[PDB]
Amino acid sequence: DDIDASAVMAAYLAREYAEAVEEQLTPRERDALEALRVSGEEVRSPLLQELSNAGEHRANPENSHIPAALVSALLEPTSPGRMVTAVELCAQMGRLWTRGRQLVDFMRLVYVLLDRLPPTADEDLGAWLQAVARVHG
């Protein structure tokens, strides 16, 4: 049978790009990453509960208007907790937007996250994710 070329290429590049940044991440940046992965997984459970409790059209939207509205509202006086929840929401939408023109919808939602981040993001998230690290080792 035939394959989805665009789907395969997507996997290769995303993984190659994932290895790119992590290599160029400083040590303290790499501890922060391991703390985001942990807290991202912790909020993931309640997050995937509210999305599914809203419906399949909401757990898997055909558009980007809905998830980008939630992200922008989480990042509107923000705290590290809201930023992580927003990061994980983007990731979950990505886990759903895996083939074809769903990839470009993913591009839009990442841009909303990074552009709507607060000025104090680098500072606050550095401190808040240190708590996460030492609570988990």
């Binding site: 807290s39 912790e42 909020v43 309640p46 997050l47 509210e50 999305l51 809203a54 909401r58 809905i66 509205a69 939630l70 509202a73 989480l74 705290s79 590290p80 907790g81 809201r82 992580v84 929840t85 927003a86 929401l89 808040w128 708590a131 996460v132 030492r134 609570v135």
Partner: peptide, 24 residues
């Protein structure tokens, strides 16, 4: 508007998450 609803529960779960580590 599920926009208002879902967001309210995200802000709620995000606040709770924030308070689990603000003191640690």
């Amino acid at each position: 508007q599920w926009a208002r609803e879902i967001g309210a529960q995200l802000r709620r779960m995000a606040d709770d998450l924030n308070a689990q580590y603000e003191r640690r």
